[model samples]
Target chain A: SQLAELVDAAAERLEVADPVAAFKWRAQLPIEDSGRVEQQLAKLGEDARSQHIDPDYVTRVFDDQIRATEAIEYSRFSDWKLNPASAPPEPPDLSASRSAIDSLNNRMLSQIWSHWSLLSAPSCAAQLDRAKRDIVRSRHLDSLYQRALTTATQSYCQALPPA
Target chain B: TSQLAELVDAAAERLEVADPVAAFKWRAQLPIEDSGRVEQQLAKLGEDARSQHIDPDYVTRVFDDQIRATEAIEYSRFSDWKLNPASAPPPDLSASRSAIDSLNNRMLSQIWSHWSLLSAPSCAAQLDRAKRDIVRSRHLDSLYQRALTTATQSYCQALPPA
Candidate 1:
């Protein structure tokens, strides 16, 4: 049940890429929004801290999350560059996308915290390993987004190997 | 999944590991100490892999960056050598490249098989799955993290710091 929820939240988070990438193209933005990135990090950091989760771990994982989303957007931009037909017909509203991402981010954190004992243990790598294979083959995700999702969550088991 | 197991079992049988010990001796022979450390490069590449797996294309993109970057820095010493033809000649890197390719092949084979990485059902899916498992098992083992430095200096030595 917990595994299913983890996968579900991840799928939902990746779903935001459609608008996230479109908004970046519409706004002519780069991957990292520097100032805004830190702002989000601060919010999540404190949120995790309040819940007694390790703030640095949460922050680091989210950092990967932010970077991976940027990669998805960049690859989409490249696609549009090669074929204008691949581009979004209209500009996306960034607010909706932000809310979607933020909602899932919080949910994902809760999921991690609830499973913190297992995730922080040796099973961290094992849990993620199973999720990766299933996620890659799930077909709910496009290949590029599949890759981005993998990047975003690859750090899920970092506390292992005694570090 | 049963099909994959059959392929691994049958193929591993046909593989004929005449000298499993010597086949991997190259792992210990590289110039790991002479080149730049790849801890961060690997961390960066691991993050980029996103697939939780490795492949030829993935290896090229991830390890290739460091491999090429090291080559670029090593060759930078030759910038002046080009201004005057006789100043120095670039050392041959064929043998260095050989060991690099050898190690690369070993990584690929570890996931897939010693035979080849692609071959429809003959050797395809099995190798594909093998790639993912390595990331999980060897993430911190210094397998590629440390040894690949030899690959860098093999190329670096060709320039020979003139």
Candidate 2:
């Protein structure tokens, strides 16, 4: 259930990509800004340590999420570069998007802690698949996104060896 | 951000294991491309992939790159070792296989991260950027890029509106 919620929550987080792309592209920003990422990682690391989770582990998870975000932004920027009007109509309020992302990030971190140990169980693979099927069924997400969903849960599997 | 670096690092680590594997294969007179073992592993990976709700085709695609990378390293080792057989005797296959298994697990986890990128429409450009930032020898880079090509291209269709 927590995994399913994480995926659902991630969908919310992913929704921000369009506006992020539009604004960044219009501003001519690079896909990655290392300085900003470092700051965020540092802050997140502090929070993770406070929560008693391994800071490095939290950093790794957020790092992947940020990479995925950059990937989405970069893809959108390329599209806008090739065809200008294809971009989002209004410039997004980044503060609002950041709020949404921040909220989801906290929620995802919570789910990670709640389900962290369970992920390595021999049964978690099957459990994760079932959760995915539920999300696909409940949310009516296209099957194409299934790959992304699976990818989201994979690092957790690595927490334990193949069982 | 750093996850991309970590994934690249894992790939680099995977490449390092090839030295030992190559030496072992050379001494055992095993062929570089073991079709039987490849097919068998592919079959198992496909089954495991499906069980995890991942595309079996994509799993096979990623695994193929790993196999190729290993072979590339093996071929290189063979070339160097053939010239100096006494000095480059085989390492223990037992140890080599265990090391490979551990590396494979790490690679598999990283594969999931890579697969997510591949499913996104903009993966190619993003990948191109990552390639620029991460350095490897030209030969190894080619091998890594060849392995990642399919996954990066998996989502050619326009993405669904967010």
Candidate 3:
């Protein structure tokens, strides 16, 4: 009940209806605020646009977004019913590390494949190429690797049945 | 009728108190009585920046980035917290987080891509500070400021809106 009340209060104070206005406010916001609004907008717009929406549409949507944004921004001042929630902060090297991760994935694949004798040479090679050409390409492989690691870890944690 | 100008000022004032972008969202969603005045507030702010002797592109970038950042907060919280209304989220938020992961990577890369273009020492220094701030703080605002500083600094020598 308290959580709901808190959220409702925030919704009222921040005017959590439309969502874009927050961005417009922060882009031009004073240096005092952390510029969180501006950062969110940039991330949203960049991500949204990448999803194939028109740039002009991005602008229009943002035009509407400012309303909610501004409302939320104002709530920070008053005995305002809203309490700002902490968003999960990202690492500074997040982007750089991401690029490095991509390179790492490629390197792992190549190194794993070079030792063809460890498994089926021709068949593994073909499967690797097929997986690479899939929609997610090597992404699925990465997921599989993660799953395998998880499964193996769990298996290790499991004890033998009565020896 | 300087409707947009009036709106801009009101919005700016509100933005100073809160986030103008969030105010815009509330206004759009609820349609308050004085909503029309907000345009004037924003326009005046734009006009003031435009009238300045410096770069219009920089000004526009500053304003747009400001707006976008505010919008993002609303979109994220509302979509995740309000609209979707997911509680607990099953603890597998990262299971399919690759979508967000890709997005994070892309935006981060795009903004940093500008590092090579800046020739101004002062602007570069600003960037260095902004980056340091983000590193020290590790918040999204740092990213916003970093992007804005990069864009504004780069456009300082670009064409005006005239």
Candidate 4:
């Protein structure tokens, strides 16, 4: 009965004083989720396979990297917070550092970057290379990695990790 | 109606065509920012309209003054290198911007508010019976208020009123 009344009310509205307005109003309604959604999933799977990357392998690698980045970043921030009177934490550039920890971070980032690069069209290679060398190295890569990990974990864990 | 949506779409389309400098000028000097200033501009526009019969260039001068002022400010903020670094925290400008933006949006609503208000009288003599019923409904009022809040907030953050 409620659905029938809704249909009646909507049908009446379609009597639309302005045909132009009515056309737009109808057009604004959500497009049906057709086969394209599954098509996209298939395409993603196909592309990953083409790159010699298995979905399970990629997921496992990402799982490990997520854990690693969180461990390192939490340690950095907690170290800063514990000594409030001291300076802010600065995790040194992973590329330049000789530490085992930095080596792991760089390895994780290098793998992530290679996957990202695989997706980019060849036309974008020059620009992407410049970004990899400069901006990614200087600030964004680590900042972005930390932020992504924090955002993902916040939904899953609900609080920052313990000191 | 499609006409209103079309008008919005048309405005969005034109935004892309405007030169970046010209776009900056419109944003910097959006008339909706201050109601009193807008009224003053309208009065000045009236004077210019009167002068249009006498000296055609009088209207040009008034508009040129606004354009020139905005262009000057935009030019000063331009960076050649684009190698700019994000600076340390400065004084909080967010509150002032929020208050001013609210006022500006209120001024903009004056035009559409009048349209909506005028239509509601005589139980929406101007609008279709179905639309009139929907508009007058309490359910519609709540939905409109919620959507209006979302729209205002989104537009404020997405872009300055350019």
Q: lDDT for every model?
A: 0.51, 0.61, 0.32, 0.31
* Inter-residue clash pairs, candidate 4: A21-B1, A21-B2
A38: Cα error in model 2, Å: 1.6
Per-residue lDDT tens digits for candidate 2, residues A36-154, read: 77877887888878987777677877776665565456445434432356777777777677777878888877877777776656777777777778887776655324444444455
What is the lDDT, from 0 to 100, of the residue B56 in candidate 4? 23
Task: Give the lowest summed-lDDT range of ten residues in model 2 chain B.
Answer: B148-157
Worst 10 residues of 4 chain B by lDDT: B80-89
Q: Report, to 2 decimal places, the DockQ of model 2.
A: 0.02
Q: Write the per-residue lDDT of candidate 4 for residues A10-98, one digit (tens) a residue.
A: 12222111232122223331111225324433544455467654544334433433333333332222222222233223433322322
Winner of 3 and 4 under DockQ: 3
| Cand. 1 Cα-lDDT | 0.51
Off by over 4 Å in 2: A136-148, A160-163, B1-162
Question: Across residues B1-162, which tens digit of lDDT does each residue of candidate 2 receive?
Answer: 433445555555665666777677667756555567889987887887777666788768666655655555555444334323455644577876676667656655655656666556666566565544554533445434543332233222356798
TM-score of predicted model 4?
0.18
Report chain A TM-scores, every model.
0.86, 0.81, 0.25, 0.27
Say which prediction, candidate 1 or candidate 2, comes out ahead on TM-score.
1
Report per-candidate DockQ. Answer: 0.02, 0.02, 0.02, 0.01
Output the number of the TM-score-best candidate: 1
The candidate 3 chain A region of ten consecutive residues with least summed lDDT is: A151-160
Model 1 regions lying over 4 Å from their true place:
A160-163, B1-162
